[PDB]
C-alpha cells in the first residue's frame, strides 16, 4: 500500500470524490522542487537512516603553540 | 403502533432483496421488518467528507 501515491491513497479510502486525475488546476499544490516519490523501503538498503542535523554544542579548542621568546 | 417501533423495511437506509428474492424473503424471514446492515452506497457518507460543499461557505458560529 505505500506503493499509491499520494491523492490516490485519499481517494482510495472514500475522503474526495474527485481523484487526482480529475481535479482542477487550481486545487493542486504549487510545486517549486521536483516531486520524488519514494515509497517505504523499510527491510532495504534504502531505509531510513536517523541522525543529528546539529553539530556538539560544545566546540574544542584546537591546539596551537607558541615558544617562550 | 407505539412512538418507537415496529418501522418497515422501505424506511430503512439499508441495502436489501428486489423481485422474487423479496418475495421469498418476506416469506423465510422470522421477521420481515429486518434489515441486512449494507448501508446504501449512494447515500451513505456521500458526498465524501473531503468533498463537501459546505466547506467553502462555513463561517466560525
Ligand atoms: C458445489 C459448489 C457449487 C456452489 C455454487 C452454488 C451456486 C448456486 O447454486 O446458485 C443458485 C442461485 C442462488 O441465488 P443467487 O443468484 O446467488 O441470489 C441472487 C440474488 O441477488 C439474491 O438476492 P438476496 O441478496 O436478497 O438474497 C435473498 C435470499 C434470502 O434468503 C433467506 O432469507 C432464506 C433463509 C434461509 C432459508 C433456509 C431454508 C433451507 O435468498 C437466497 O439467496 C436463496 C436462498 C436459498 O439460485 C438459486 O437460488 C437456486 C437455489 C437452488
Known amino acids: 500500500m505505500s506503493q499509491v501515491e499520494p491523492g490516490w491513497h485519499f481517494w482510495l479510502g472514500y475522503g474526495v470524490d474527485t481523484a487526482p486525475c480529475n481535479t482542477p488546476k487550481e486545487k493542486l499544490p504549487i510545486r517549486a522542487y521536483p516531486y520524488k516519490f519514494q515509497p517505504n523501503y523499510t527491510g532495504t538498503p534504502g531505509a531510513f537512516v536517523t541522525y543529528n542535523t546539529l553539530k556538539p554544542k560544545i566546540s574544542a579548542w584546537e591546539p596551537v603553540t607558541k615558544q617562550r621568546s | 403502533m407505539l412512538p418507537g417501533g415496529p418501522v418497515p423495511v422501505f424506511k430503512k437506509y439499508t441495502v436489501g432483496s428486489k423481485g422474487i428474492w423479496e418475495k421469498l424473503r418476506?416469506?423465510?424471514?422470522?421477521?420481515p421488518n429486518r434489515s441486512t446492515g449494507n448501508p446504501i452506497v449512494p447515500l451513505y457518507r456521500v458526498p465524501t467528507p473531503g468533498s463537501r460543499p459546505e466547506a467553502n461557505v462555513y463561517q466560525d458560529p
Open chain 2, 26 to 31: 418476506v416469506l423465510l424471514a422470522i421477521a
